[PDB]
Design a protein around this ligand. Sequence first.
Ligand code: 0BU
Length: 476
Amino acid sequence: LPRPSGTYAGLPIADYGDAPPLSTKTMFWRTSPEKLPPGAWEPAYLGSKDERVDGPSLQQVMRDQLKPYSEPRGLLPPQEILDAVCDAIENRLENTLEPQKPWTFKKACESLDKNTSSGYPYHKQKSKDWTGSAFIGDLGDQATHANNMYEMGKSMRPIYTAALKDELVKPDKIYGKIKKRLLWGSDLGTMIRAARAFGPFCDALKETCIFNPIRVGMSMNEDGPFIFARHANFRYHMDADYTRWDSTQQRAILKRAGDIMVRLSPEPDLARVVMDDLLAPSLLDVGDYKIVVEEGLPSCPCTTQLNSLAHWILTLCAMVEVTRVDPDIVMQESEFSFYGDDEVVSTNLELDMVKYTMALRRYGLLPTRADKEEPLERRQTLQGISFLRRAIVGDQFGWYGRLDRASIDRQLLWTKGPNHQNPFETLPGHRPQLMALLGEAAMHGEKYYRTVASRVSKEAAVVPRHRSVLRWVRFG
Ligand SMILES: O=C(Nc1cccc(C(=O)Nc2ccc(S(=O)(=O)O)c3cc(S(=O)(=O)O)cc(S(=O)(=O)O)c23)c1)Nc1cccc(C(=O)Nc2ccc(S(=O)(=O)O)c3cc(S(=O)(=O)O)cc(S(=O)(=O)O)c23)c1
Protein backbone atom coordinates (compact mmCIF):
# COMPACT_ATOMS: atom_id res chain seq x y z
CA LEU A 1 0.00 0.00 0.00
CA PRO A 2 1.49 3.32 -1.17
CA ARG A 3 0.27 6.75 0.05
CA PRO A 4 -2.70 7.86 -2.02
CA SER A 5 -2.56 11.11 -4.00
CA GLY A 6 -4.77 13.58 -5.74
CA THR A 7 -7.04 16.44 -4.83
CA TYR A 8 -9.75 16.78 -2.23
CA ALA A 9 -11.80 19.99 -2.16
CA GLY A 10 -9.01 21.84 -4.01
CA LEU A 11 -6.39 20.61 -1.53
CA PRO A 12 -3.66 18.00 -2.08
CA ILE A 13 -4.21 14.50 -0.60
CA ALA A 14 -1.26 13.35 1.48
CA ASP A 15 -2.50 10.13 3.07
CA TYR A 16 -5.41 7.95 4.16
CA GLY A 17 -7.61 9.16 7.01
CA ASP A 18 -8.10 7.68 10.48
CA ALA A 19 -10.93 10.02 11.48
CA PRO A 20 -14.28 8.71 12.73
CA PRO A 21 -17.35 9.71 10.72
CA LEU A 22 -18.95 13.15 11.10
CA SER A 23 -21.69 13.41 13.74
CA THR A 24 -25.24 13.26 12.44
CA LYS A 25 -26.49 14.29 15.88
CA THR A 26 -27.13 17.44 17.97
CA MET A 27 -26.83 18.10 21.69
CA PHE A 28 -29.73 20.56 21.57
CA TRP A 29 -33.27 19.74 22.67
CA ARG A 30 -36.41 21.87 22.79
CA THR A 31 -37.79 22.93 26.17
CA SER A 32 -41.46 22.67 25.18
CA PRO A 33 -43.26 20.71 22.43
CA GLU A 34 -44.80 23.97 21.14
CA LYS A 35 -44.09 25.08 17.53
CA LEU A 36 -41.12 27.39 17.13
CA PRO A 37 -41.81 31.04 16.31
CA PRO A 38 -41.19 32.13 12.67
CA GLY A 39 -37.48 32.45 11.73
CA ALA A 40 -36.36 31.00 15.08
CA TRP A 41 -32.85 29.49 15.38
CA GLU A 42 -32.30 25.75 15.32
CA PRO A 43 -29.29 23.38 15.61
CA ALA A 44 -27.10 23.26 12.51
CA TYR A 45 -27.80 20.77 9.70
CA LEU A 46 -27.31 17.09 10.53
CA GLY A 47 -26.67 15.44 7.16
CA SER A 48 -28.58 13.07 4.87
CA LYS A 49 -30.45 11.67 7.93
CA ASP A 50 -31.72 15.18 8.88
CA GLU A 51 -35.52 14.99 9.03
CA ARG A 52 -35.92 18.80 8.50
CA VAL A 53 -34.50 19.10 4.93
CA ASP A 54 -33.00 17.23 2.00
CA GLY A 55 -29.54 18.71 1.54
CA PRO A 56 -26.07 17.29 0.70
CA SER A 57 -23.92 14.87 2.72
CA LEU A 58 -21.91 16.33 5.63
CA GLN A 59 -18.60 15.57 3.89
CA GLN A 60 -19.89 17.70 1.04
CA VAL A 61 -20.84 20.41 3.57
CA MET A 62 -17.35 20.10 5.04
CA ARG A 63 -15.75 20.25 1.57
CA ASP A 64 -17.52 23.63 1.10
CA GLN A 65 -15.96 24.94 4.31
CA LEU A 66 -12.44 24.04 3.03
CA LYS A 67 -12.85 25.93 -0.25
CA PRO A 68 -11.52 29.31 0.99
CA TYR A 69 -8.43 27.50 2.30
CA SER A 70 -7.21 27.09 -1.27
CA GLU A 71 -8.16 30.70 -2.12
CA PRO A 72 -5.18 33.00 -2.92
CA ARG A 73 -3.81 34.89 0.10
CA GLY A 74 -4.29 38.64 0.34
CA LEU A 75 -1.23 40.87 0.51
CA LEU A 76 1.34 41.23 3.22
CA PRO A 77 1.38 44.68 4.87
CA PRO A 78 4.36 46.83 3.79
CA GLN A 79 7.55 45.46 5.32
CA GLU A 80 8.46 48.91 6.70
CA ILE A 81 5.13 48.87 8.56
CA LEU A 82 5.05 45.19 9.59
CA ASP A 83 8.38 45.52 11.36
CA ALA A 84 7.65 48.68 13.38
CA VAL A 85 4.24 47.31 14.40
CA CYS A 86 5.81 43.98 15.34
CA ASP A 87 8.50 45.72 17.37
CA ALA A 88 5.99 47.92 19.14
CA ILE A 89 3.81 45.01 20.17
CA GLU A 90 6.85 43.01 21.29
CA ASN A 91 8.09 45.98 23.30
CA ARG A 92 4.59 46.45 24.83
CA LEU A 93 4.39 42.82 26.00
CA GLU A 94 8.01 43.02 27.23
CA ASN A 95 7.05 45.98 29.45
CA THR A 96 3.83 44.41 30.70
CA LEU A 97 4.26 40.64 31.03
CA GLU A 98 5.71 38.95 34.11
CA PRO A 99 8.50 36.44 33.22
CA GLN A 100 7.41 32.84 33.88
CA LYS A 101 8.81 29.53 35.12
CA PRO A 102 8.53 26.72 32.52
CA TRP A 103 5.36 24.67 32.44
CA THR A 104 5.88 21.13 33.66
CA PHE A 105 4.50 18.03 31.97
CA LYS A 106 2.15 17.59 34.93
CA LYS A 107 0.94 21.17 34.34
CA ALA A 108 0.28 20.69 30.61
CA CYS A 109 -1.57 17.48 31.35
CA GLU A 110 -3.85 19.13 33.94
CA SER A 111 -4.59 22.11 31.63
CA LEU A 112 -6.17 20.01 28.87
CA ASP A 113 -9.97 20.07 28.56
CA LYS A 114 -10.78 16.51 29.56
CA ASN A 115 -14.30 16.41 28.06
CA THR A 116 -13.25 16.81 24.42
CA SER A 117 -11.62 14.21 22.11
CA SER A 118 -7.92 13.33 22.08
CA GLY A 119 -7.90 13.30 18.24
CA TYR A 120 -5.30 11.41 16.17
CA PRO A 121 -4.86 8.61 16.64
CA TYR A 122 -6.98 7.24 19.49
CA HIS A 123 -10.05 9.52 19.05
CA LYS A 124 -11.31 8.88 22.59
CA GLN A 125 -12.52 11.43 25.11
CA LYS A 126 -9.44 12.55 27.13
CA SER A 127 -11.25 11.49 30.33
CA LYS A 128 -11.26 7.77 29.36
CA ASP A 129 -7.52 7.73 30.25
CA TRP A 130 -7.34 10.40 33.00
CA THR A 131 -6.98 9.63 36.73
CA GLY A 132 -7.43 13.05 38.33
CA SER A 133 -3.64 13.37 38.20
CA ALA A 134 -2.23 11.84 34.97
CA PHE A 135 -2.91 10.11 31.67
CA ILE A 136 -2.72 6.35 31.60
CA GLY A 137 -2.98 3.72 28.85
CA ASP A 138 -2.90 4.90 25.24
CA LEU A 139 -3.25 8.59 26.00
CA GLY A 140 -0.58 8.07 28.70
CA ASP A 141 1.80 6.79 26.01
CA GLN A 142 0.91 9.45 23.43
CA ALA A 143 1.56 12.12 26.05
CA THR A 144 4.85 10.62 27.25
CA HIS A 145 6.25 10.26 23.75
CA ALA A 146 5.21 13.86 22.83
CA ASN A 147 6.74 15.21 26.02
CA ASN A 148 10.05 13.47 25.19
CA MET A 149 10.16 15.15 21.78
CA TYR A 150 9.54 18.55 23.35
CA GLU A 151 12.40 18.28 25.85
CA MET A 152 14.74 17.06 23.07
CA GLY A 153 13.72 19.86 20.65
CA LYS A 154 12.64 17.26 18.04
CA SER A 155 9.95 17.94 15.46
CA MET A 156 6.55 16.25 15.34
CA ARG A 157 3.89 16.66 12.64
CA PRO A 158 0.53 17.75 14.14
CA ILE A 159 -2.40 15.85 12.64
CA TYR A 160 -5.78 17.59 12.75
CA THR A 161 -9.21 15.95 12.70
CA ALA A 162 -11.86 17.88 10.82
CA ALA A 163 -15.28 18.16 12.36
CA LEU A 164 -18.36 20.37 11.94
CA LYS A 165 -19.79 22.59 14.72
CA ASP A 166 -22.99 21.54 16.43
CA GLU A 167 -24.59 24.91 17.23
CA LEU A 168 -27.71 27.06 16.92
CA VAL A 169 -27.84 28.89 13.57
CA LYS A 170 -30.14 31.33 11.77
CA PRO A 171 -32.82 29.28 9.88
CA ASP A 172 -31.44 30.28 6.45
CA LYS A 173 -28.37 28.09 7.13
CA ILE A 174 -30.60 25.02 7.49
CA TYR A 175 -33.30 25.67 4.92
CA GLY A 176 -31.53 28.05 2.54
CA LYS A 177 -27.87 27.66 1.50
CA ILE A 178 -26.74 25.04 4.01
CA LYS A 179 -23.60 25.78 6.10
CA LYS A 180 -21.90 24.45 9.24
CA ARG A 181 -18.67 25.74 10.80
CA LEU A 182 -15.57 23.58 10.37
CA LEU A 183 -13.43 22.79 13.42
CA TRP A 184 -9.85 21.44 13.58
CA GLY A 185 -9.44 18.81 16.29
CA SER A 186 -5.80 18.90 17.28
CA ASP A 187 -4.05 15.70 18.41
CA LEU A 188 -3.01 15.15 22.03
CA GLY A 189 0.74 15.08 21.36
CA THR A 190 0.46 18.53 19.81
CA MET A 191 -1.89 19.64 22.62
CA ILE A 192 0.81 18.61 25.09
CA ARG A 193 3.78 20.21 23.33
CA ALA A 194 1.80 23.43 22.69
CA ALA A 195 0.65 23.46 26.30
CA ARG A 196 4.21 23.15 27.70
CA ALA A 197 5.69 25.57 25.20
CA PHE A 198 3.09 28.39 25.28
CA GLY A 199 1.09 27.86 28.47
CA PRO A 200 3.54 30.12 30.35
CA PHE A 201 3.03 32.94 27.82
CA CYS A 202 -0.77 32.30 27.85
CA ASP A 203 -0.65 32.76 31.67
CA ALA A 204 1.39 35.98 31.56
CA LEU A 205 -0.91 37.40 28.91
CA LYS A 206 -4.00 36.36 30.88
CA GLU A 207 -2.80 38.12 34.07
CA THR A 208 -2.80 41.39 32.12
CA CYS A 209 -5.98 40.78 30.06
CA ILE A 210 -6.95 44.38 31.01
CA PHE A 211 -3.85 46.55 30.40
CA ASN A 212 -3.06 44.66 27.19
CA PRO A 213 -5.59 44.22 24.35
CA ILE A 214 -5.69 40.43 24.25
CA ARG A 215 -8.91 39.81 26.18
CA VAL A 216 -8.67 35.99 26.36
CA GLY A 217 -9.45 34.80 29.91
CA MET A 218 -11.42 37.91 30.89
CA SER A 219 -14.63 37.71 32.93
CA MET A 220 -17.37 39.73 31.27
CA ASN A 221 -18.89 40.58 34.64
CA GLU A 222 -15.81 41.37 36.67
CA ASP A 223 -13.61 42.77 33.88
CA GLY A 224 -16.21 44.10 31.44
CA PRO A 225 -16.73 47.34 33.38
CA PHE A 226 -13.02 48.20 33.63
CA ILE A 227 -12.29 47.15 30.04
CA PHE A 228 -15.11 49.17 28.48
CA ALA A 229 -14.23 52.11 30.77
CA ARG A 230 -10.77 52.17 29.18
CA HIS A 231 -12.39 52.08 25.70
CA ALA A 232 -14.71 55.02 26.48
CA ASN A 233 -11.62 57.20 27.19
CA PHE A 234 -11.22 57.55 23.38
CA ARG A 235 -13.24 59.55 20.80
CA TYR A 236 -13.95 57.05 18.02
CA HIS A 237 -15.14 53.45 18.29
CA MET A 238 -15.52 50.65 15.68
CA ASP A 239 -15.91 46.91 15.06
CA ALA A 240 -14.70 45.53 11.74
CA ASP A 241 -17.00 42.44 11.94
CA TYR A 242 -14.90 39.92 9.97
CA THR A 243 -16.29 37.13 7.81
CA ARG A 244 -14.23 33.87 7.58
CA TRP A 245 -11.38 35.19 9.69
CA ASP A 246 -9.50 31.94 10.12
CA SER A 247 -9.64 30.87 6.50
CA THR A 248 -8.44 34.26 5.20
CA GLN A 249 -5.36 34.27 7.43
CA GLN A 250 -1.79 34.44 6.20
CA ARG A 251 0.82 32.03 7.52
CA ALA A 252 3.24 34.94 6.95
CA ILE A 253 1.35 36.98 9.53
CA LEU A 254 0.90 33.99 11.87
CA LYS A 255 4.65 33.37 11.73
CA ARG A 256 5.27 36.98 12.89
CA ALA A 257 2.78 36.44 15.71
CA GLY A 258 4.39 33.08 16.46
CA ASP A 259 7.81 34.74 16.69
CA ILE A 260 6.59 37.10 19.39
CA MET A 261 5.25 34.17 21.39
CA VAL A 262 8.48 32.22 20.92
CA ARG A 263 10.66 35.19 21.93
CA LEU A 264 8.51 35.80 25.01
CA SER A 265 8.48 32.19 26.25
CA PRO A 266 10.56 30.91 29.16
CA GLU A 267 12.05 28.17 26.89
CA PRO A 268 12.39 29.90 23.47
CA ASP A 269 14.42 27.07 21.86
CA LEU A 270 11.91 24.37 22.72
CA ALA A 271 9.09 26.77 21.88
CA ARG A 272 10.64 27.51 18.47
CA VAL A 273 10.40 23.85 17.46
CA VAL A 274 6.72 23.72 18.48
CA MET A 275 5.76 26.94 16.69
CA ASP A 276 7.39 25.82 13.43
CA ASP A 277 5.43 22.54 13.70
CA LEU A 278 2.23 24.46 14.33
CA LEU A 279 2.77 26.67 11.27
CA ALA A 280 4.15 24.21 8.69
CA PRO A 281 1.62 23.04 6.09
CA SER A 282 -1.17 21.50 8.13
CA LEU A 283 -2.16 17.83 7.85
CA LEU A 284 -5.97 17.64 8.07
CA ASP A 285 -7.87 14.35 8.47
CA VAL A 286 -11.22 14.71 6.62
CA GLY A 287 -12.22 11.09 7.07
CA ASP A 288 -11.11 8.98 4.13
CA TYR A 289 -8.02 11.09 3.62
CA LYS A 290 -5.44 13.28 5.30
CA ILE A 291 -4.98 16.46 3.21
CA VAL A 292 -2.31 19.20 3.39
CA VAL A 293 -3.47 22.73 4.01
CA GLU A 294 -0.69 25.26 3.35
CA GLU A 295 -2.57 28.42 4.41
CA GLY A 296 -5.08 29.96 6.81
CA LEU A 297 -5.41 29.46 10.56
CA PRO A 298 -6.15 25.93 11.93
CA SER A 299 -9.60 26.68 13.55
CA CYS A 300 -5.84 23.54 18.53
CA PRO A 301 -7.18 25.62 21.53
CA CYS A 302 -3.89 27.54 22.21
CA THR A 303 -4.21 29.30 18.83
CA THR A 304 -6.69 31.83 20.21
CA GLN A 305 -3.81 33.90 21.52
CA LEU A 306 -1.87 33.46 18.29
CA ASN A 307 -5.06 34.38 16.49
CA SER A 308 -5.64 37.47 18.70
CA LEU A 309 -1.99 38.42 18.16
CA ALA A 310 -2.11 38.26 14.36
CA HIS A 311 -5.36 40.25 14.73
CA TRP A 312 -3.44 42.83 16.81
CA ILE A 313 -0.69 42.97 14.14
CA LEU A 314 -3.16 43.31 11.27
CA THR A 315 -5.23 46.10 12.85
CA LEU A 316 -2.20 48.08 14.00
CA CYS A 317 -0.68 47.80 10.49
CA ALA A 318 -3.82 49.08 8.71
CA MET A 319 -4.00 52.05 11.08
CA VAL A 320 -0.27 52.82 10.83
CA GLU A 321 -0.69 52.63 7.04
CA VAL A 322 -3.57 55.11 7.00
CA THR A 323 -2.65 57.66 9.73
CA ARG A 324 1.09 57.48 8.92
CA VAL A 325 1.67 57.61 12.69
CA ASP A 326 4.12 55.38 14.65
CA PRO A 327 2.51 52.17 16.03
CA ASP A 328 3.66 53.38 19.44
CA ILE A 329 1.74 56.63 19.12
CA VAL A 330 -1.24 54.77 17.62
CA MET A 331 -1.32 52.64 20.79
CA GLN A 332 -0.98 55.79 22.91
CA GLU A 333 -4.08 57.13 21.15
CA SER A 334 -6.16 53.93 21.08
CA GLU A 335 -7.57 51.09 23.10
CA PHE A 336 -8.02 47.64 21.55
CA SER A 337 -9.88 44.46 22.44
CA PHE A 338 -9.22 41.23 20.60
CA TYR A 339 -10.53 37.75 21.14
CA GLY A 340 -9.67 35.68 18.10
CA ASP A 341 -11.64 37.35 15.34
CA ASP A 342 -13.72 39.46 17.74
CA GLU A 343 -12.66 43.08 18.19
CA VAL A 344 -13.40 46.55 19.48
CA VAL A 345 -11.15 49.36 18.28
CA SER A 346 -11.12 52.71 20.07
CA THR A 347 -9.03 55.66 19.05
CA ASN A 348 -8.67 59.41 19.14
CA LEU A 349 -7.07 59.47 15.67
CA GLU A 350 -9.11 60.64 12.67
CA LEU A 351 -9.17 57.40 10.67
CA ASP A 352 -9.78 57.59 6.94
CA MET A 353 -12.35 54.79 7.07
CA VAL A 354 -12.10 54.36 3.28
CA LYS A 355 -8.29 53.92 3.23
CA TYR A 356 -8.67 51.73 6.36
CA THR A 357 -11.31 49.33 4.93
CA MET A 358 -9.30 49.31 1.70
CA ALA A 359 -6.21 48.16 3.61
CA LEU A 360 -8.02 45.44 5.55
CA ARG A 361 -9.47 43.97 2.33
CA ARG A 362 -6.03 44.01 0.77
CA TYR A 363 -4.55 42.01 3.64
CA GLY A 364 -7.05 39.32 2.59
CA LEU A 365 -9.63 40.06 5.29
CA LEU A 366 -13.40 40.29 4.84
CA PRO A 367 -14.72 43.11 7.05
CA THR A 368 -18.46 43.76 6.74
CA ARG A 369 -20.54 46.89 7.41
CA ALA A 370 -23.05 46.77 10.30
CA ASP A 371 -25.85 47.03 7.70
CA LYS A 372 -24.10 44.68 5.16
CA GLU A 373 -24.28 47.18 2.24
CA GLU A 374 -21.36 48.20 -0.02
CA PRO A 375 -16.48 51.24 3.77
CA LEU A 376 -16.66 50.58 7.55
CA GLU A 377 -18.37 53.24 9.68
CA ARG A 378 -17.15 54.58 13.02
CA ARG A 379 -19.06 56.14 15.93
CA GLN A 380 -18.49 58.76 18.64
CA THR A 381 -20.44 56.58 21.08
CA LEU A 382 -19.22 53.25 22.43
CA GLN A 383 -22.82 52.25 23.16
CA GLY A 384 -23.90 49.82 20.43
CA ILE A 385 -20.66 47.98 19.74
CA SER A 386 -20.52 44.35 20.86
CA PHE A 387 -17.82 42.12 22.31
CA LEU A 388 -17.95 38.41 23.25
CA ARG A 389 -21.59 37.94 22.13
CA ARG A 390 -22.69 40.67 24.57
CA ALA A 391 -23.80 44.24 23.87
CA ILE A 392 -21.69 46.96 25.54
CA VAL A 393 -23.99 49.17 27.64
CA GLY A 394 -23.42 52.25 29.80
CA ASP A 395 -25.38 53.74 32.69
CA GLN A 396 -24.79 55.89 35.77
CA PHE A 397 -22.86 53.01 37.43
CA GLY A 398 -20.63 52.39 34.44
CA TRP A 399 -20.25 49.98 31.56
CA TYR A 400 -21.33 46.37 31.19
CA GLY A 401 -21.89 43.66 28.62
CA ARG A 402 -25.52 42.69 28.32
CA LEU A 403 -26.71 39.57 26.49
CA ASP A 404 -29.33 40.59 23.91
CA ARG A 405 -33.04 39.80 24.22
CA ALA A 406 -32.80 37.33 21.33
CA SER A 407 -29.95 35.30 22.86
CA ILE A 408 -31.94 35.11 26.07
CA ASP A 409 -35.13 33.96 24.32
CA ARG A 410 -33.05 31.50 22.27
CA GLN A 411 -31.49 30.01 25.44
CA LEU A 412 -35.00 29.45 26.77
CA LEU A 413 -36.17 27.43 23.79
CA TRP A 414 -33.16 25.09 23.81
CA THR A 415 -31.20 23.15 26.39
CA LYS A 416 -28.15 20.88 26.14
CA GLY A 417 -28.35 17.11 26.53
CA PRO A 418 -27.20 13.76 25.16
CA ASN A 419 -26.77 13.56 21.39
CA HIS A 420 -29.88 12.73 19.37
CA GLN A 421 -31.18 12.77 15.80
CA ASN A 422 -34.24 15.04 16.20
CA PRO A 423 -33.67 18.52 17.66
CA PHE A 424 -37.43 19.04 18.10
CA GLU A 425 -37.76 16.23 20.69
CA THR A 426 -38.09 17.61 24.19
CA LEU A 427 -35.90 16.14 26.90
CA PRO A 428 -37.48 14.27 29.80
CA GLY A 429 -36.15 15.39 33.24
CA HIS A 430 -34.11 18.66 33.18
CA ARG A 431 -31.39 22.93 34.90
CA PRO A 432 -28.93 24.85 37.15
CA GLN A 433 -27.47 27.86 33.81
CA LEU A 434 -31.08 28.99 34.37
CA MET A 435 -29.56 30.97 37.26
CA ALA A 436 -27.47 33.26 35.00
CA LEU A 437 -30.34 33.58 32.52
CA LEU A 438 -32.51 35.40 35.02
CA GLY A 439 -29.47 37.66 35.69
CA GLU A 440 -29.13 38.64 32.03
CA ALA A 441 -32.83 39.54 31.79
CA ALA A 442 -32.60 41.80 34.85
CA MET A 443 -30.34 44.22 32.95
CA HIS A 444 -33.11 44.87 30.41
CA GLY A 445 -35.33 46.34 33.17
CA GLU A 446 -38.39 45.03 35.06
CA LYS A 447 -41.11 44.69 32.37
CA TYR A 448 -38.79 42.41 30.40
CA TYR A 449 -37.65 40.67 33.58
CA ARG A 450 -41.14 39.72 34.84
CA THR A 451 -41.91 38.07 31.46
CA VAL A 452 -38.61 36.15 31.50
CA ALA A 453 -39.21 35.19 35.15
CA SER A 454 -42.66 34.09 33.95
CA ARG A 455 -41.06 31.58 31.51
CA VAL A 456 -38.44 30.61 34.14
CA SER A 457 -40.95 29.84 36.94
CA LYS A 458 -43.14 27.88 34.49
CA GLU A 459 -40.11 25.63 33.89
CA ALA A 460 -40.83 23.97 37.29
CA ALA A 461 -42.80 21.43 35.20
CA VAL A 462 -37.81 31.60 44.94
CA VAL A 463 -37.64 33.54 41.70
CA PRO A 464 -35.85 36.51 43.35
CA ARG A 465 -37.16 40.08 43.07
CA HIS A 466 -35.89 42.11 40.11
CA ARG A 467 -34.29 44.60 42.56
CA SER A 468 -32.35 41.78 44.28
CA VAL A 469 -31.12 40.11 41.09
CA LEU A 470 -30.12 43.31 39.24
CA ARG A 471 -27.68 44.28 42.03
CA TRP A 472 -26.18 40.79 42.35
CA VAL A 473 -25.36 40.54 38.63
CA ARG A 474 -24.26 44.18 38.29
CA PHE A 475 -22.31 44.75 41.48
CA GLY A 476 -21.78 41.28 43.03
O1 0BU B 1 -19.99 28.57 7.52
C1 0BU B 1 -20.00 29.81 7.51
N1 0BU B 1 -19.35 30.51 6.56
C2 0BU B 1 -18.66 29.87 5.61
C3 0BU B 1 -17.33 29.52 5.85
C4 0BU B 1 -16.60 28.86 4.88
C5 0BU B 1 -17.18 28.57 3.65
C6 0BU B 1 -18.50 28.94 3.39
C7 0BU B 1 -19.07 28.62 2.16
O2 0BU B 1 -20.27 28.35 2.08
N2 0BU B 1 -18.24 28.59 1.10
C8 0BU B 1 -18.79 28.20 -0.05
C9 0BU B 1 -19.70 27.15 -0.04
C10 0BU B 1 -20.28 26.72 -1.23
C11 0BU B 1 -19.93 27.32 -2.43
S1 0BU B 1 -20.68 26.75 -3.95
O3 0BU B 1 -20.80 25.22 -3.91
O4 0BU B 1 -19.80 27.15 -5.14
O5 0BU B 1 -22.07 27.37 -4.08
C12 0BU B 1 -19.00 28.37 -2.44
C13 0BU B 1 -18.67 28.95 -3.66
C14 0BU B 1 -17.76 30.00 -3.72
S2 0BU B 1 -17.37 30.73 -5.32
O6 0BU B 1 -17.94 32.14 -5.41
O7 0BU B 1 -18.00 29.85 -6.41
O8 0BU B 1 -15.85 30.78 -5.55
C15 0BU B 1 -17.17 30.46 -2.54
C16 0BU B 1 -17.49 29.87 -1.32
S3 0BU B 1 -16.72 30.50 0.13
O9 0BU B 1 -16.09 29.36 0.94
O10 0BU B 1 -17.79 31.19 0.97
O11 0BU B 1 -15.66 31.52 -0.27
C17 0BU B 1 -18.42 28.82 -1.26
C18 0BU B 1 -19.24 29.58 4.38
N3 0BU B 1 -20.66 30.54 8.44
C19 0BU B 1 -21.35 29.97 9.43
C20 0BU B 1 -21.80 28.65 9.36
C21 0BU B 1 -22.53 28.12 10.42
C22 0BU B 1 -22.82 28.88 11.56
C23 0BU B 1 -22.39 30.20 11.62
C24 0BU B 1 -22.62 31.01 12.72
O12 0BU B 1 -21.72 31.78 13.04
N4 0BU B 1 -23.81 30.97 13.38
C25 0BU B 1 -23.82 31.79 14.45
C26 0BU B 1 -23.23 31.36 15.63
C27 0BU B 1 -23.19 32.20 16.74
C28 0BU B 1 -23.72 33.49 16.67
S4 0BU B 1 -23.65 34.58 18.13
O13 0BU B 1 -22.73 34.01 19.22
O14 0BU B 1 -23.10 35.94 17.68
O15 0BU B 1 -25.06 34.77 18.70
C29 0BU B 1 -24.29 33.93 15.47
C30 0BU B 1 -24.82 35.23 15.39
C31 0BU B 1 -25.41 35.70 14.22
S5 0BU B 1 -26.09 37.40 14.15
O16 0BU B 1 -26.89 37.69 15.43
O17 0BU B 1 -27.05 37.58 12.97
O18 0BU B 1 -24.93 38.39 14.03
C32 0BU B 1 -25.45 34.86 13.10
C33 0BU B 1 -24.92 33.57 13.17
S6 0BU B 1 -25.00 32.56 11.79
O19 0BU B 1 -23.73 31.72 11.66
O20 0BU B 1 -26.22 31.64 11.95
O21 0BU B 1 -25.17 33.43 10.54
C34 0BU B 1 -24.34 33.09 14.35
C35 0BU B 1 -21.65 30.72 10.56
